[PDB]
Amino acid sequence: PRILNSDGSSNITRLGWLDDHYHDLLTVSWPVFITLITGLYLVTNALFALAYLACGDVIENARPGSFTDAFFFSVQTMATIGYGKLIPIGPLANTLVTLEALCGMLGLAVAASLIYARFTRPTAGVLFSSRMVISDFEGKPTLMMRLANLRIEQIIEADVHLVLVRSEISQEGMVFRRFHDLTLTRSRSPIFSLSWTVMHPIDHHSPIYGETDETLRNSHSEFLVLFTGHHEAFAQNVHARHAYSCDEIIWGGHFVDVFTTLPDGRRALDLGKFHEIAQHHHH
Amino acid sequence: ITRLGWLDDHYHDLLTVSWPVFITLITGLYLVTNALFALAYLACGDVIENARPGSFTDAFFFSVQTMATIGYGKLIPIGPLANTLVTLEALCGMLGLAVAASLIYARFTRPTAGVLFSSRMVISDFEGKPTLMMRLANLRIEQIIEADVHLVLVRSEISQEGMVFRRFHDLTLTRSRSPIFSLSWTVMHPIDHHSPIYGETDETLRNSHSEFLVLFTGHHEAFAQNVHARHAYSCDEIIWGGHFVDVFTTLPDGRRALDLGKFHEIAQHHHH
Ligand SMILES: [K+]
Ligand SMILES: [K+]
Ligand SMILES: [K+]
């Protein structure tokens, strides 16, 4: 019954048409977005076709009072193919033409913006260790997990936040979910390129100090990781988030080493080991 | 390593104008330039195929067909002069589009933080000290990263020189940063000997004609772009002793939920 999913998205039921037009257009699935555009596209042409027919027989070589011909003319005119069979006739016909033209290009301008707006989004090639572990590092128990860069390109001034979210009781007895940012031994990595094992030493200042497993479940506590940095691939900022529940903490565990030796003998990175955690089993 | 796995502020004005007007401006410019070009054509004189001699309409409409590059084919350039004007217009047309597009995109690509502000603030005991607070709710499924908020008191004061003006006090929040704002955030300004509103009653707040300004900003994942939102409270929108109700619920299913209805609800003790 977790508050936060693995993907980092909160896991809650929200309780609440043209209101949020811009957001919606960027939020919709490509299929739908294209459909919407198409719909609008056809629609307006039909509208214009009617405008033409309304004037009546104002298009060269058009079957009298036929919507098809008018519609197709309308597209040839708005897309500015303008083949040349169907042609405007008289002031009314033509004014509608120069109006449509403008409309066509404006549509393109709007379409383009939308396309570019939804198209130009990078994604940090970052993978999160499926688990966290708590183990002795440098003489103090330390909470940790690790990121692996999935691309050849590097991420500059990358940095990461490890935030504990758990329930608390105030002196006044208010019961709330609070956020604790956990001091990391290393929060900045000016050049993140392969793997980074993040660590939160646990001492008298750690909000999880002298805390067992039982105690973590009891505060219904989770752990949220936010990574961000500047990806050279895209020459633009990227970010990635991930969340762990109390039960994804492997106590006593140690992340295996991803750095391996081949028959060639050169050091290599194996992403397979990335999720592997060493563990002592004591019967 | 081997991986195994009037014309002064033109730009501002163009972005600031209402869509109706902006489209009009564009349209105006559009028609205008075509008329200009039409004249250029007529100026040469009868240089367009199938054009009624010395008729502006024909020239104008030709000009549009040429600049929008429909180029139907009835009206056609004739001779060097006609055509040069053509290849000139063409260029002009596309450039216009490039400019129009930029403008369109520039004014079109403006996200809005899906953020809702609690209609009221409250002053109540939290963690053993009276605390001023209000709360934000994210109205979208998408998350806002490194979100942060400013709580600024604005009130009247006296200078040593005795100027009675309006000053800004940023109020220390127990939590000013939220790297991941996703549902609801209750912002708090503990009131102690350092709070500009320390040992202040309601009467005293009205007296300084004091208000409270909230600025929220953060990076919205929806738009992959920065967003912001501002809100303001007057002295009388402070509910003394009040406590924001809880928006969280456990469903019958045992699954957590958020009710935005409760969001504006403030608990209160009435003592006859
Ligand atoms: K064309
Ligand atoms: K064409
Ligand atoms: K043609």
Side-chain angles (χ1 to χ4, degrees), chain A residues 1-16 18-104 106-139 141-173 175-213 215-266 268-282, chain B residues 1-5 7-93 95-128 130-162 164-202 204-255 257-271:
Chain A
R2 48 197 304 175
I3 318 308
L4 292 168
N5 306 325
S6 313
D7 74 296
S9 69
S10 76
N11 192 19
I12 305 296
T13 313
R14 275 98 164 359
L15 312 181
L18 295 175
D19 209 6
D20 200 346
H21 82 301
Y22 183 58
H23 162 284
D24 295 352
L25 282 169
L26 295 191
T27 298
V28 156
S29 77
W30 279 111
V32 180
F33 171 76
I34 310 174
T35 298
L36 283 184
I37 286 188
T38 311
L40 180 42
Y41 175 52
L42 308 190
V43 168
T44 71
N45 274 304
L47 285 174
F48 261 94
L50 270 47
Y52 284 116
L53 294 189
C55 298
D57 298 353
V58 264
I59 295 155
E60 200 60 49
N61 289 289
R63 296 193 281 97
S66 103
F67 174 75
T68 312
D69 296 25
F71 173 87
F72 283 117
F73 171 72
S74 163
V75 322
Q76 323 205 334
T77 206
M78 186 192 47
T80 63
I81 316 170
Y83 280 131
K85 266 291 178 185
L86 325 172
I87 308 171
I89 293 171
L92 302 191
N94 291 286
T95 310
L96 273 185
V97 173
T98 91
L99 202 87
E100 194 151 18
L102 174 81
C103 275
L106 290 197
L108 187 78
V110 173
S113 317
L114 284 167
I115 307 288
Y116 171 102
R118 26 184 311 147
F119 198 69
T120 49
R121 314 166 173 195
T123 42
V126 187
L127 173 71
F128 296 79
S129 54
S130 52
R131 293 294 172 294
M132 317 195 65
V133 323
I134 301 187
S135 82
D136 284 31
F137 168 91
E138 223 132 32
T142 306
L143 177 66
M144 32 195 161
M145 48 77 50
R146 55 183 185 172
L147 315 148
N149 175 0
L150 289 185
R151 299 165 168 147
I152 329 81
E153 295 73 13
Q154 331 205 305
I155 311 186
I156 63 153
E157 66 174 9
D159 67 37
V160 70
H161 289 267
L162 196 35
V163 175
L164 151 72
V165 183
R166 67 171 179 207
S167 313
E168 305 198 317
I169 293 298
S170 177
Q171 297 179 12
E172 298 73 28
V175 57
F176 56 97
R177 290 283 283 170
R178 192 191 211 154
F179 291 49
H180 286 90
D181 212 319
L182 309 179
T183 318
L184 308 177
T185 80
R186 189 174 167 86
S187 173
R188 250 297 195 303
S189 167
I191 285 160
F192 175 49
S193 33
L194 313 177
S195 184
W196 180 6
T197 303
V198 204
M199 306 170 205
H200 164 77
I202 311 185
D203 64 8
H204 31 254
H205 291 159
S206 171
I208 55 185
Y209 179 67
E211 203 93 32
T212 55
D213 187 336
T215 46
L216 278 184
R217 295 200 152 81
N218 279 0
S219 36
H220 197 299
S221 49
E222 308 174 338
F223 299 83
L224 191 39
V225 180
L226 168 53
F227 165 99
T228 76
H230 178 101
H231 210 302
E232 282 176 17
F234 313 107
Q236 187 182 1
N237 267 243
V238 290
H239 74 268
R241 41 176 171 78
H242 192 76
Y244 301 109
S245 45
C246 34
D247 61 288
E248 328 221 47
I249 303 175
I250 283 166
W251 299 77
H254 296 105
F255 281 107
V256 159
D257 187 352
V258 306
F259 301 106
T260 304
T261 304
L262 269 192
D264 190 1
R266 44 181 177 181
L269 177 63
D270 174 350
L271 293 182
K273 304 182 178 302
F274 186 70
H275 289 290
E276 281 178 12
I277 308 186
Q279 187 149 35
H280 181 290
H281 304 258
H282 207 310
Chain B
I1 278 193
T2 309
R3 299 175 168 258
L4 315 166
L7 295 176
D8 208 7
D9 200 346
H10 82 301
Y11 183 57
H12 162 283
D13 296 352
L14 281 168
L15 295 191
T16 299
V17 156
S18 77
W19 279 111
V21 180
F22 171 76
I23 309 174
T24 298
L25 283 183
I26 286 188
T27 311
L29 180 41
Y30 175 51
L31 308 190
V32 168
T33 71
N34 275 304
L36 285 174
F37 261 94
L39 270 47
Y41 284 116
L42 294 189
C44 298
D46 298 353
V47 264
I48 295 155
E49 199 60 49
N50 289 289
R52 296 192 281 97
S55 103
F56 174 76
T57 312
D58 296 25
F60 173 87
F61 282 116
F62 171 71
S63 163
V64 322
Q65 322 206 334
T66 206
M67 186 192 47
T69 63
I70 316 170
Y72 279 132
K74 266 290 178 185
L75 325 172
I76 308 170
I78 293 171
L81 302 192
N83 290 286
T84 310
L85 273 185
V86 173
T87 91
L88 202 87
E89 194 151 18
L91 174 80
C92 275
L95 289 196
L97 187 79
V99 172
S102 318
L103 283 168
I104 307 287
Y105 170 103
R107 26 184 312 147
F108 197 69
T109 48
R110 313 172 175 192
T112 42
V115 187
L116 173 71
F117 296 79
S118 56
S119 53
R120 293 294 172 295
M121 316 195 65
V122 322
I123 301 187
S124 83
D125 284 31
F126 168 91
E127 222 131 33
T131 306
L132 176 67
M133 32 195 160
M134 48 77 49
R135 55 183 185 172
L136 316 148
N138 175 0
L139 288 185
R140 300 164 168 148
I141 329 81
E142 295 73 12
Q143 331 205 305
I144 312 186
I145 63 153
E146 66 174 9
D148 68 37
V149 69
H150 289 267
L151 196 35
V152 175
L153 150 73
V154 183
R155 68 170 179 206
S156 313
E157 306 197 318
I158 299 302
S159 175
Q160 297 190 347
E161 297 81 25
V164 55
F165 61 89
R166 292 280 285 169
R167 191 191 212 154
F168 293 48
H169 287 90
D170 212 319
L171 309 179
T172 318
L173 309 177
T174 80
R175 189 173 167 86
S176 172
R177 250 297 195 303
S178 167
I180 285 160
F181 176 49
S182 34
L183 313 178
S184 184
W185 181 5
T186 303
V187 204
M188 306 169 205
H189 164 78
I191 311 185
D192 64 8
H193 31 255
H194 291 159
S195 171
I197 56 186
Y198 179 67
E200 203 93 33
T201 54
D202 187 336
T204 46
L205 278 184
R206 295 200 153 82
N207 279 0
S208 37
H209 198 299
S210 49
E211 308 174 339
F212 299 83
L213 191 39
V214 180
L215 168 53
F216 165 100
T217 77
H219 178 101
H220 210 301
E221 283 176 16
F223 313 107
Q225 187 182 1
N226 267 243
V227 290
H228 74 268
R230 41 176 171 79
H231 192 75
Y233 301 108
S234 45
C235 35
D236 61 288
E237 328 222 46
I238 303 175
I239 283 165
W240 299 78
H243 296 105
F244 281 107
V245 158
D246 188 352
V247 304
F248 300 108
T249 304
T250 317
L251 294 176
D253 182 13
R255 34 173 199 159
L258 177 63
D259 176 347
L260 294 181
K262 304 182 178 303
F263 186 70
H264 289 290
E265 281 178 12
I266 308 186
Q268 187 149 35
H269 181 290
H270 302 256
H271 208 309

